[PDB]
């Protein structure tokens, strides 16, 4: 089972064996693979488990596979103190441009940025290039995209 997965949250452990789905027995894994792959996200269902000859039932809710723009999770800072960067994922298009966790955006594209609302109003303009006036530490730097 994968971490932060609904099944992990549900209580599914390795060595389990799935026997039924919402009451209906399952014909094959490749069938079940096709079954839930067609249900819309969040489909609350019930499963039939088998670990060590004991029937277990669990209810589940599908999972995916503050703002977040192009592989970077963000949130607000203070009272119009910019947009503080909580953390960055490395191999994503966000940190492939040199972004590191902790940076705080004061402005962008010569337009003042006080919160995330003034940011997405710059994304509503869709500039060919975005020039960010962030501050990491005691420095005033710029970072670009696209």
């Amino acid at each position: 089972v994968l971490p932060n997965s609904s099944a992990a949250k549900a209580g599914i452990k390795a060595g389990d064996v799935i026997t039924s789905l919402n009451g209906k027995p399952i014909s094959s894994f490749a069938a079940l693979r096709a079954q839930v792959g067609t249900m819309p996200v969040g489909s609350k269902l019930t499963l039939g488990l088998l670990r060590d000859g004991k029937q277990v039932n669990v209810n589940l809710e599908l999972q995916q596979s503050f703002n977040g723009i192009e592989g970077a999770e963000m949130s607000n800072k203070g009272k119009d103190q910019g947009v503080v960067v909580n953390n960055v994922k490395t191999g994503t298009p966000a940190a492939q441009i040199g972004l590191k966790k902790g940076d705080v955006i004061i402005g962008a594209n010569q337009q003042a940025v006080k919160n995330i609302a003034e940011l997405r109003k710059v994304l509503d303009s869709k500039p060919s290039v975005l020039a960010l006036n962030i501050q990491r530490g005691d420095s005033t730097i710029y970072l670009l995209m696209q």
Binding site: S5, A7, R33, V36, G37, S65
Partner: peptide, 5 residues
């Protein structure tokens, strides 16, 4: 033998 969810 490996296939997601």
């Amino acid at each position: 033998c490996y296939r997601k969810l």
